RNA sequence: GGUUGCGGCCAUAUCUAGCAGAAAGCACCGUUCCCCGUUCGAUCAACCGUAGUUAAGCUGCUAAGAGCAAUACCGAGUAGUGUAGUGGGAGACCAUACGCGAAACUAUUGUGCUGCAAUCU
RNA sequence: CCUAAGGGGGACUCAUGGAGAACAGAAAUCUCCAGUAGAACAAAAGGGUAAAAGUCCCCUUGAUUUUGAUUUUCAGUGUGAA
RNA sequence: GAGGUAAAGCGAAUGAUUAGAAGUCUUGGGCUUAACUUAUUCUCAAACUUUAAAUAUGUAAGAAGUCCUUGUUGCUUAAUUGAACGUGGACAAUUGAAUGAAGAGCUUUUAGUGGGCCAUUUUUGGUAAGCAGAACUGGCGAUGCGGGAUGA
């Protein structure tokens, strides 16, 4: 057996992670969290700096960034809304060797939401984790194992799937 | 400055190397261990001549440096700097200690120098050259012997150059395609591991 | 400054075996110890409770007390010109049954069986063990094995 | 540019874990705590209620550990339930309860503690432990072993717990992991627990889904539809099953369609066999020759 | 003989790269009313066994495979060492006598075995 | 030195490397893969530890009461510690 | 049973270390040097190590043993299970290795001593010392006698 045209080998999005790494804590981070909760409909989570850097103006355990994970149709909707901003043209160097891809918008009003002077504009980071069925093997508690080589997601497969599913361009 | 070597001739102490426990140790006088045409291939210098220790003894880095310089100078002067490849086979890793540089109270010494601890039959210097350059290389080692304490023997090796094979087994493995160059040394064929990689690396391998 | 702490000098004694670190296999916890059992003492470095002192590492003794997770072992230690009875509390991770019991108890069973069978057959048997005796006479055949003469070899250098 | 990691020295010095830890099946920390017995209770074993859930089955076993390997005392599976009248929902919380009750009754029949330690004959969902009878043998003590499965209030392992406890086994436990436990007001709602014992949640899903999404009701509850089982008679399926389980908890092995030898002969046809040393040497010689 | 659950020893079982897998099991897999837990029903919880798949997991096989294990007219009775002499040698050290005796190396072979219960073309 | 850095339970996995993501760069945050511990565990060094002894979370006071036995140092006295 | 010293090892971990060769620089500069990576190469460790002696060291080699039957308890077991201690029965001088045994066991009481030194072997500090400091044994002290001319 071991047929490549099997139903269970179908590529599909596992999760989309939206990152805003505002370099400071306080009002700006709170408004970035408001932007993320507006876009995703989910409460985001704030990430703390792992260590202190004077050049970047951050300190250890200072709440720096904010991020949120979306899965399913909502992930698909946000991803295509962001691909509109990218005018459906990613680079060959946007896809990792493990088959994941990402891009970064610079203004969140380009996505298609209302602008508020109080909130201001935050840039945003999009990352999509690709994967087939059976990834639960690597994430479950009992009998956790690894995924076979053929079932793994790679760069070429992800690029071809993105081009087919979005009629977009991958600039080599 | 330096005491006579007789004060440090014998392996009386346990090995005392540089470590996290003694750190302020000077450098050995010998820093260069390979001389002559060290880039020559194995086939260029078939004849190997050794200076071998007949003593369980300590040789200072100063003596190693002096003998290296003496042998190198003589052989390059008589036969040319590219007619041989000389290798010093002992590295001074043992730290000698000196006390004076009160009385016997707190007499633990300070690092004073470096010495190599050599055994009986241990090779001190190796010189790979051509056969026609035998008497020259021998006289280079025989002069270098004067810089060392104790008894040393000059032994003509049974082996091809610096390889572990005799001068006939090397020729057999060479005509059988089991030896390839690696710069100054060689790699030998293995009948273990990936068959395809082994065959690719040794194309002229007449399998039996 | 001299240091004579409890675990001084146990750097290698209390180390785990190479590629044998980590969890204890549970046959250690499934063995059953009774008062009078002979047990070897070997400290396990990964269990620090109920650990023996370094003197008892490698000693063999008699179980005298059984508690929830431990046994009491009797050791005889030389202190000057006599032995002193020492009573050591050890968790069962540091204890193993001594293999000398099963051998002597097997010689006892074998002697009883041989004696009863010899009585059944009406003969006698000697049960005392014997040291190895000098071998008897024998004849060495040389068919296919004619003696080969060896000589001491000349001196050679192989470097 | 970077060092290759999987060197021969890495493999040489690697210490592989225990076989069943590398399989991700045995938690040896918890296993040591469960199995290890008080040393003054010399050869008396501790008995575990191993409860494991697969995608299709509930496995409940009473096990004691020995040096040569674990020994099963009794075992009840969820696929035995159709014999007792439960054919569908073989992984309910209620199916878990029935399996726990079955293994408890079977163990007590095997021991002889049937008339003594009957259990909770009238299941009302109240928290209760099997109390010993004075001047009689103590109840069979068993400790719950849920393996790698997480402890959550409402989990099915505690369904097997509750079934086994009501079946007459003494299994020490607390009611704060049962469905219906109010964590703020630390008391157990026995009405909701009885609902879960008799499939009340499943029946409520049937009733709530039928009048809202009939197509999903038709796909999810097909077997009930072709069996003409409604919500109001869901509970009785369990209530009868309980009774039957207490009536005859003995194990009836499935009659085997083939013998051991027939099974082995059939399976041996689909088993690749190791190449002989000479065979692989010949393969190597052939590959060398075709390499010239 | 396969498979599952629980194991004993804990690589002959691990690792890399390929290939095959009948039956059942296991698995991925579907859903969110309910108990429950999350930024995210991804993990964890519950529900259906209904819509699908052996693609992956798992199992076995392949490789002058890495590793691991075992063995030995392998090295080597070598290195080391207990005991001895009014032995040698200026010494450093060495030989001999009565005993014990490695490691590396080399070569060959192997690559989980097994207990309880249940189940299966 | 520590109300936790003590106790119990649970969940998670560390150092580091590679490949990717607006500002963002050698170092901020996000993602996947590899990762026998090359991290961490108050403080010297050694030992020990990976579904933990490490990180995070929840609940707590076993750091409580009574007085014996034992180990180390040892005279088989004391003290400390266990 | 235990051990980690001698030896050994370093194309095995840690740490040290000589030389070329082939690749990558994409995150070094001016064809080039230097970095890394890969397979090799010379040499090491009291406070390194996979391995690992010799000597030394723990225990056992019976009658207070082994086996068979069944009494007590408030301990323990789901138990009629065990734990410990027992009643009763069987196994007799080859009663269960060697060699030796001016016998074994037990108690009281009190003297001197608490400067040591030397030789072989192991060993630390020191250039060394008829120096200073340890290990095991044997000695001198405390001991004459034959030999080393003489000499603890
Ligand atoms: Mg010295
Ligand atoms: Mg050890
Ligand atoms: Mg403690
Ligand atoms: Mg647990
Ligand atoms: Mg702590
Ligand atoms: Mg705590
Ligand atoms: Mg924990
Ligand atoms: Mg005391
Ligand atoms: Mg004391
Ligand atoms: Mg030591
Ligand atoms: Mg050594
Ligand atoms: Mg070695
Ligand atoms: Mg090394
Ligand atoms: Mg007096
Ligand atoms: Mg006195
Ligand atoms: Mg005095
Ligand atoms: Mg005197
Ligand atoms: Mg005398
Ligand atoms: Mg005289
Ligand atoms: Mg004289």
Curated annotation (Swiss-Prot), chain B:
Q: Where in the cell is it found?
A: Cytoplasm
Can you supply a Gene Ontology BP term from the record? translation
Origin: domain of life: Eukaryota
Alphabetized, the UniProt keywords read: Cytoplasm, Ribonucleoprotein, Ribosomal protein
InterPro entries tied to this protein: Ribosomal_uL16, Ribosomal_uL16_CS_euk_arc, Ribosomal_uL16_dom, Ribosomal_uL16_euk_arch, Ribosomal_uL16_sf
PROSITE patterns from the xrefs?
RIBOSOMAL_L10E
Q: Name one GO molecular function term.
A: structural constituent of ribosome
Query: Record's PANTHER family?
Result: 60S RIBOSOMAL PROTEIN L10 (PTHR11726)
Q: Which family does it belong to?
A: Belongs to the universal ribosomal protein uL16 family.
Q: Protein name, please?
A: Large ribosomal subunit protein uL16
Biological source species: Candida albicans (strain SC5314 / ATCC MYA-2876)
Highest classification ranks of the organism: Eukaryota, Fungi, Dikarya, Ascomycota, Saccharomycotina
Q: Which gene encodes it?
A: RPL10
UniProtKB/Swiss-Prot annotation, chain D:
InterPro entries the record matches: Rbsml_uL18_euk, Ribosomal_uL18_C_euk
Q: Which GO terms describe its cellular component?
A: cytosolic large ribosomal subunit
Q: Which GO terms describe its biological process?
A: ribosomal large subunit assembly; translation
Which compartment or compartments is the protein found in?
Answer: Cytoplasm
The Gene Ontology terms for molecular function here are: 5S rRNA binding; structural constituent of ribosome
The record's subunit annotation is: Component of the large ribosomal subunit. Mature ribosomes consist of a small (40S) and a large (60S) subunit. The 40S subunit contains about 32 different proteins and 1 molecule of RNA (18S). The 60S subunit contains 45 different proteins and 3 molecules of RNA (25S, 5.8S and 5S).
This chain's function reads: Component of the ribosome, a large ribonucleoprotein complex responsible for the synthesis of proteins in the cell. The small ribosomal subunit (SSU) binds messenger RNAs (mRNAs) and translates the encoded message by selecting cognate aminoacyl-transfer RNA (tRNA) molecules. The large subunit (LSU) contains the ribosomal catalytic site termed the peptidyl transferase center (PTC), which catalyzes the formation of peptide bonds, thereby polymerizing the amino acids delivered by tRNAs into a polypeptide chain.
- Say which family it is in: Belongs to the universal ribosomal protein uL18 family.
UniProt protein name: Large ribosomal subunit protein uL18
| Species the sequence originates in | Candida albicans (strain SC5314 / ATCC MYA-2876) (Yeast)
Starting at the broadest rank, the lineage of the source organism is: Eukaryota, Fungi, Dikarya, Ascomycota, Saccharomycotina
């Amino acid at each position: 057996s071991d047929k490549s045209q099997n139903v269970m080998r179908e590529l599909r999005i596992e999760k989309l992670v939206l990152n805003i790494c505002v370099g400071e804590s306080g009002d700006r981070l709170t408004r970035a969290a408001k932007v993320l909760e507006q876009l995703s409909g989910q409460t985001p989570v704030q990430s703390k700096a792992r260590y202190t850097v004077r050049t970047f103006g951050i300190r250890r355990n200072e709440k720096i960034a904010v991020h949120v994970t979306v899965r399913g149709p909502k992930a698909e909707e946000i991803l295509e809304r962001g691909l509109k901003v990218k005018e459906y043209q990613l680079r060959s160097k946007n896809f990792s060797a493990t088959g994941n891809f990402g891009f970064g918008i610079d203004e969140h009003i380009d996505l298609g939401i209302k602008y508020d002077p109080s909130i201001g504009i935050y840039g945003m980071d999009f990352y999509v984790v690709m994967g087939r069925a059976g990834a639960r093997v690597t994430r479950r508690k009992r009998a956790r194992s690894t995924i076979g080589n053929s079932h793994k997601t790679n760069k070429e497969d992800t690029i071809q799937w993105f081009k087919t599913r979005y009629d977009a361009e991958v600039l080599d | 400055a330096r005491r006579p070597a007789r004060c440090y001739r014998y392996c009386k102490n346990k090995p005392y190397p540089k470590s996290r426990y003694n750190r302020a140790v000077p450098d050995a006088k010998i820093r260069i261990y390979d001389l002559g045409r060290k880039k020559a291939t194995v086939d260029e210098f078939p004849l190997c001549i050794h200076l071998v220790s007949n003593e369980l003894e300590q040789l200072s880095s100063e003596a190693l440096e002096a003998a290296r310089i003496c042998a190198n100078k003589y052989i390059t002067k008589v036969s040319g700097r590219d007619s041989f490849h000389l290798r010093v086979r002992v590295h001074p890793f043992h730290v000698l200690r000196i006390n004076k540089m009160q009385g016997m109270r707190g007499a633990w010494g300070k690092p004073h120098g470096l010495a190599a601890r050599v055994s009986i039959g241990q090779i001190i210097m190796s010189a790979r050259t051509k056969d026609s350059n035998k008497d020259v290389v021998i006289e280079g080692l025989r002069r270098a012997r004067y810089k060392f304490p104790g008894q040393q023997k000059i032994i003509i090796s049974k082996k091809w150059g610096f390889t572990p094979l005799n001068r006939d087994e090397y020729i057999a493995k060479k005509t059988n395609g089991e030896v390839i160059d690696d710069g100054a040394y060689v790699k030998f064929l293995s009948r273990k591991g990936n068959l395809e990689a082994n065959l690719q690396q040794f194309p002229n391998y007449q399998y039996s | 400054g001299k240091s004579r702490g409890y675990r001084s000098g146990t750097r290698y004694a209390f180390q785990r075996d190479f590629k044998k670190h980590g969890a204890i296999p549970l046959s250690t916890y499934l063995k059953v110890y009774k008062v009078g059992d002979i047990v070897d003492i070997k400290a396990n470095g990964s269990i620090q409770k109920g650990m023996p002192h370094k003197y008892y590492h490698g000693k063999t003794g008699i179980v005298y007390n059984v508690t929830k997770s431990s046994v009491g072992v009797i050791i005889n230690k030389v202190v000057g010109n006599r032995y002193i009875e020492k009573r050591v509390n050890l968790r069962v991770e540091h204890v193993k049954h001594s293999a000398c019991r099963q051998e002597f108890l097997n010689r006892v069973k074998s002697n009883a069986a041989k004696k009863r069978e010899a009585k059944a057959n009406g003969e006698t048997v000697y049960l005392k063990r014997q040291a190895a005796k000098p071998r008897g006479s024998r004849i060495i055949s040389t068919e296919g094995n004619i003696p080969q003469t060896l000589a001491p070899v000349a001196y050679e250098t192989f470097i | 540019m970077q060092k290759e990691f999987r060197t021969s020295a890495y493999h040489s010095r690697f210490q592989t874990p225990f076989r069943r830890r590398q399989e991700g099946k045995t938690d040896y920390y918890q296993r040591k705590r469960l199995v290890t017995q008080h040393k003054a209770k010399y050869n008396s074993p501790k008995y575990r209620l191993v409860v494991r859930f697969t995608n299709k089955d509930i496995i409940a076993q009473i096990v004691s550990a020995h040096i040569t390997g674990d020994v099963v005392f009794t075992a009840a599976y969820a696929h035995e339930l159709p014999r007792y009248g439960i054919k569908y929902g073989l992984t309910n919380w209620s199916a878990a309860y029935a399996v726990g009750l079955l293994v408890a009754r079977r163990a007590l029949q095997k021991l002889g503690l049937d008339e003594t330690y009957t259990g909770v004959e009238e299941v009302e969902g109240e928290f209760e432990l099997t109390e010993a009878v004075e001047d009689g043998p103590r109840p069979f003590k068993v400790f719950l072993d849920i393996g790698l499965q997480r402890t959550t209030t409402g989990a099915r392992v505690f369904g097997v717990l509750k079934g086994a406890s009501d079946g007459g086994l003494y299994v020490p436990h607390s009611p704060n992991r049962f469905p219906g436990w109010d964590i703020e007001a630390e008391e157990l709602d026995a009405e909701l627990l009885r609902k879960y014992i008799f499939g009340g949640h499943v029946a409520e899903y049937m009733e709530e889904l039928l009048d809202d999404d009939e197509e999903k009701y038709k796909s999810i509850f097909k077997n009930y539809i072709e069996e003409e089982i409604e919500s109001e008679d869901v509970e009785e399926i369990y209530a009868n099953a309980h009774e039957a389980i207490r009536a005859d908890p003995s194990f009836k092995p499935t009659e085997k369609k083939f013998t051991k030898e027939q099974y082995k002969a059939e399976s041996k046809k689909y088993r690749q066999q190791k190449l002989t040393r000479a065979e692989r040497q010949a393969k190597v010689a052939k590959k060398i020759a075709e390499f010239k």
